[PDB]
Amino acid sequence: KRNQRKVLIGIVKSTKNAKTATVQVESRFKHPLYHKSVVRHKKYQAHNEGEVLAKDGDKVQIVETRPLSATKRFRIAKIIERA
Amino acid sequence: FEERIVKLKRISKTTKGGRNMRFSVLVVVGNRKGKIGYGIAKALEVPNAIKKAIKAAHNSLHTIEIHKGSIYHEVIGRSGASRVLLKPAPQGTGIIAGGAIRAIIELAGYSDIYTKNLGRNTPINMIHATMDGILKQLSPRRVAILRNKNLNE
Amino acid sequence: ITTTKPIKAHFDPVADLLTKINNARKAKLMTVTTIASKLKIAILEILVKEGYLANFQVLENKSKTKRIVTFNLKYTQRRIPSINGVKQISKPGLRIYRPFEKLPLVLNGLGIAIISTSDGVMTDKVARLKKIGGEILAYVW
Amino acid sequence: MKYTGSIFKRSRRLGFSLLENNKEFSKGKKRKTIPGQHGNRFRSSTMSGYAQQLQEKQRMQYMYGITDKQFRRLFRLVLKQRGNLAVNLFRVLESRLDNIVYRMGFAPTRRSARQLVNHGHVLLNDRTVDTPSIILNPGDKVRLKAKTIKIPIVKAASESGVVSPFVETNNKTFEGTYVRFPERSELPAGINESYVVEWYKRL
Amino acid sequence: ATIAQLIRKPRKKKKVKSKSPALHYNLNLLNKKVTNVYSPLKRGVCTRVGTMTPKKPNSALRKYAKVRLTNGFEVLTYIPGEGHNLQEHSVTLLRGGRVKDLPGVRYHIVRGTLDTVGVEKRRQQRSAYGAKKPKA
Amino acid sequence: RMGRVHYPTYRIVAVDSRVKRDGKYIALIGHLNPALKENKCKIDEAVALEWLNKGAKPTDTVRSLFSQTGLWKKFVESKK
RNA sequence: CAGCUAGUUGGUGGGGUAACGGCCUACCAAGGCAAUGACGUGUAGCUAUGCUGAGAAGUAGAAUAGCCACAAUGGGACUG
RNA sequence: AUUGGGCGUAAAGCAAGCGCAGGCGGAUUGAAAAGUCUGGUGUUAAAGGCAGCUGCUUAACAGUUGUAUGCAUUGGAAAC
RNA sequence: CAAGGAUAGCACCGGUGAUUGGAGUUAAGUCGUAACAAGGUACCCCUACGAGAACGUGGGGGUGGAUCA
RNA sequence: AAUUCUUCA
């Protein structure tokens, strides 16, 4: 690909289904009502190519690619090892 | 001295038989050049009450200087649960305040200043809030003396 | 030298410093003691170096872990405080941040405002010279 | 309105004359009170900022013959740019065609000049105009369509009319120019600038 | 007020009701529903004409009308001015406002341009509560 | 074009022909307020040539404006 | 308004589209969304903006113009 | 009520307690850059809001010139 | 594939609905006088019973109570 | 045991 480097660091939760992993991403910003710093979590289901593996408990990176299925728009490139 | 008067009340104490109608007056006095004061009095007739108020206002004067014609910082008059906010104004735009406070700050000798009342609209406590707000301020020469600096830089 | 009295932090040295200095000014006291951090020594230095305080000593013990600090208040004879009030802006319950262009002046800019920049805690206008922003910790007048 | 039609009715109540003193000087009985059934002392009943502010507004906008929305437009115009509001306002209120023609000595009354300008008997920089609305900037010449030479009102005005300091003109050639801005002390000082300006908080 | 609660519990505005609920609704014939366009005034037909005494501080003998509008709502209204020209189901046009002598009445009557004509002999303030100016 | 009645002011703009008049456009070229034909049209003189070289066809009235200012001569010889 | 969800989430062969794709299909699967508010209901074309306000913003989405949807209502397809 | 309020007697402290989740949170040290600071690049249609200028007998207006604000991307430092 | 058509049964939201429950507001309307003082039986709160009502009484609690103390 | 005192300022 050529698109911008999507920085979507987050704790991948489960690869309960084959060649598919669900990762939650945490985003911090300023709430536009009281200027309080607030975070939200959002889920994303991504495809694992197979040459690189993502496991449970990791904090991995996600990039954009062509749509493979319904609500699966992304693929994984880098996997931070376990702890 | 200009000796302008502000809102007057109609009060009466109660005894056996009718009521003792004896209203009170409040007044502000100033030379429009730096010396100002205020007073409150009561009497049976208008001229006597006015004269007593003028006396009690004029004996109890206090001094305040003029910085370029306005105040250079913000003050919050806080007395008797009646706030009033004062914010600095440019070299000149025209006086903006409430009527009673308009008289108070015009008779002091200021050109223009940002004024807005908060809370109650009772003139006497409003004047007192203006007083303690304008008095408890401090000068750049004051901080120059107390801080280890000759001139404020 | 042998403070002899047990002390402890409040919840955060930032609020504790202002509360203790305000209480000392109100009660016309000389010094107080408070838990010391590198942020504490930095803030004390950058506030005293502008004539708003006096000598402050950081006090540690035989070990390298227990540190406190006590500061002398700025005063003039007849006991008129040089400090005319403090109000902390950044709170543990509410973070506040301000860019360079919107750093407010101290009631005309005549006073001193302490801004925690990305590289050094240091006052308002001399930070406006370097345009480096940060968070505002306290208004002192 | 463009013209009320009565001039004494307000100089009576407002207490000051339209001109120096010649209008309300004497015509059988000199009076300086309010007209109607109320010849009586009224000076200690409604004295306050609003009352005299309105009185000064009314005095000013009958001195200059302008209505209230016209002057609101003028105040909006002068509020746009920098400058002391009182000075600019007092300078622009004098910058009307009729009042300049009055000050030049070409008319014995401002209202006659206002009628004549709308009647198209005056040239604005070698061009005609029937709208007394433009503000006169320095460096502009005026002539009165010299066909007007036979008009009795204009020769009567030019006979011994009061020549204003801030304006220059020749009456034997009916040709004039507006050279300099007005000073505070060179104009009728009966208007309190601070009081009239402070009346306006709506804009 | 602790801000950690305000994020979890946003503040709410009061936004008190209007001075006139009846003058807002309109009614069509399309299996009618209820809609509001904040109508300044509405046409109606009277059904009741009578009189009623005011509350405690004063005393008089006013006149009221029970008018059904283009909507299903029926509402009381006040008749202003001298005289009376309501004759038991004549079309009328309402106007907003409020009265204090008659509780439960908040509507005046535009008097002058309908089957009801505003009385003469009224020349001061004759535009409001209409009355044709006599020629002189 | 947009302006006052009895006094039009047509801005010359290169835009696709499938959008309505005076609608959304891409780049601004110039303006014409009709009170003279000697010096009343002014263009950036660079973006117009860029548009004409990247594929465009001038509007019917725009040819005169291009001819008045003397731009056609460098145009055609640029093409061939 | 505490459950919603059954081509719903995922895999492989194939078809189809301007293309990715449950868009469809054969089989295998058992998932997916939800208190950081889905689902249900109520009202609403969105935006630049207009008014007010010092501002954070309250409010109307006039006219105008950008985008979306509709053409008696509900459907279907050809032409290009 | 973020800039901008209170809960002794004026409306308001749940009867009290145990506490999951959430939020807040002592000191040293390195790293990280998620926020936070910040150079550059791209973009935020036009008109209109605003500031100058030109013309319609002049304001109304029309035109022209410039004008903030948010967002992405990229490079730098690490007080909290 | 299928717009629609017919059938039957669930879910949601209204309009009206004999008769009735109470509610608010009204020039001087009828019964008693509960409370404000020790309101003449201290009041108030919770609860249960009872009376045409004002409310009375029983149990628990407070002074937001009076004087003698 | 021990009660009521018509609206209007």
UniProtKB/TrEMBL annotation, chain F:
The keyword S-adenosyl-L-methionine does not apply. Keywords: Ribonucleoprotein, Ribosomal protein. SUPFAM superfamilies: Ribosomal protein S16. The keyword ATP-binding does not apply. GO terms for cellular component: cytoplasm; small ribosomal subunit. Signal peptide: none annotated. Belongs to the bacterial ribosomal protein bS16 family. This is Small ribosomal subunit protein bS16. It comes from Mycoplasmoides pneumoniae (strain ATCC 15531 / DSM 23978 / CIP 103766 / NBRC 14401 / NCTC 10119 / FH) (Mycoplasma pneumoniae).
